[PDB]
Amino acid sequence: MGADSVISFAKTLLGKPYVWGAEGPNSFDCSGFTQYVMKKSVGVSIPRVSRDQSKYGTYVNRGDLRSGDLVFFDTQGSNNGSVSHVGIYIGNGDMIHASSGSSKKVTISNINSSYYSSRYVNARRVL
């Protein structure tokens, strides 16, 4: 019911625009979205950037994801494997996130889709 608060608050922000460096209340980047949602719903403080949120809280295996877990991804091509994206797991593979893809807004995407699945890094439980 921590998780129910996180997810229902996050859904009120659906359609809000992506702006790099923003952390609410009107615009967001992917880690600014997760920070703002966690702080405003249930008063949980997480790190500002995706790579630091990826090192915070309880490690979760991808098969054990629960509503409210943070899910982390890298960037497609030649890289470090460095975490560059984060979403809030909802269930059925779905996450809510501030997508810098084509939609450039808070939206819902599936971590099992061809695009996200290969970029999946790790997950963290902060509730």
Side-chain angles (χ1 to χ4, degrees):
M1 75 194 192
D4 301 343
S5 178
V6 169
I7 296 176
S8 55
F9 180 64
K11 288 198 189 167
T12 68
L13 305 173
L14 280 162
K16 294 209 105 75
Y18 183 97
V19 170
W20 198 89
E23 63 265 298
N26 308 317
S27 64
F28 303 96
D29 65 23
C30 71
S31 56
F33 177 68
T34 59
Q35 198 187 57
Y36 180 81
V37 160
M38 283 308 163
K39 174 183 76 175
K40 285 281 224 185
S41 58
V42 294
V44 159
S45 302
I46 76 187
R48 177 58 183 84
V49 302
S50 63
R51 60 203 169 262
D52 293 339
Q53 297 187 2
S54 188
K55 295 183 264 183
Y56 178 78
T58 306
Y59 176 99
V60 177
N61 285 122
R62 178 177 172 166
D64 192 58
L65 283 171
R66 285 185 203 173
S67 305
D69 294 339
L70 300 180
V71 284
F72 302 92
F73 310 80
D74 62 24
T75 285
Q76 40 256 218
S78 37
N79 228 228
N80 306 280
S82 178
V83 168
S84 55
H85 197 67
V86 58
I88 303 170
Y89 191 75
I90 61 194
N92 295 111
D94 281 343
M95 57 176 177
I96 186 160
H97 61 138
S99 163
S100 74
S102 57
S103 289
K104 285 305 207 130
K105 62 186 42 166
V106 176
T107 191
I108 288 164
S109 310
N110 200 285
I111 77 179
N112 301 308
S113 75
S114 63
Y115 186 41
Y116 295 100
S117 192
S118 70
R119 297 162 63 220
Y120 181 100
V121 174
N122 76 340
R124 295 286 182 184
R125 187 164 297 148
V126 295
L127 304 169

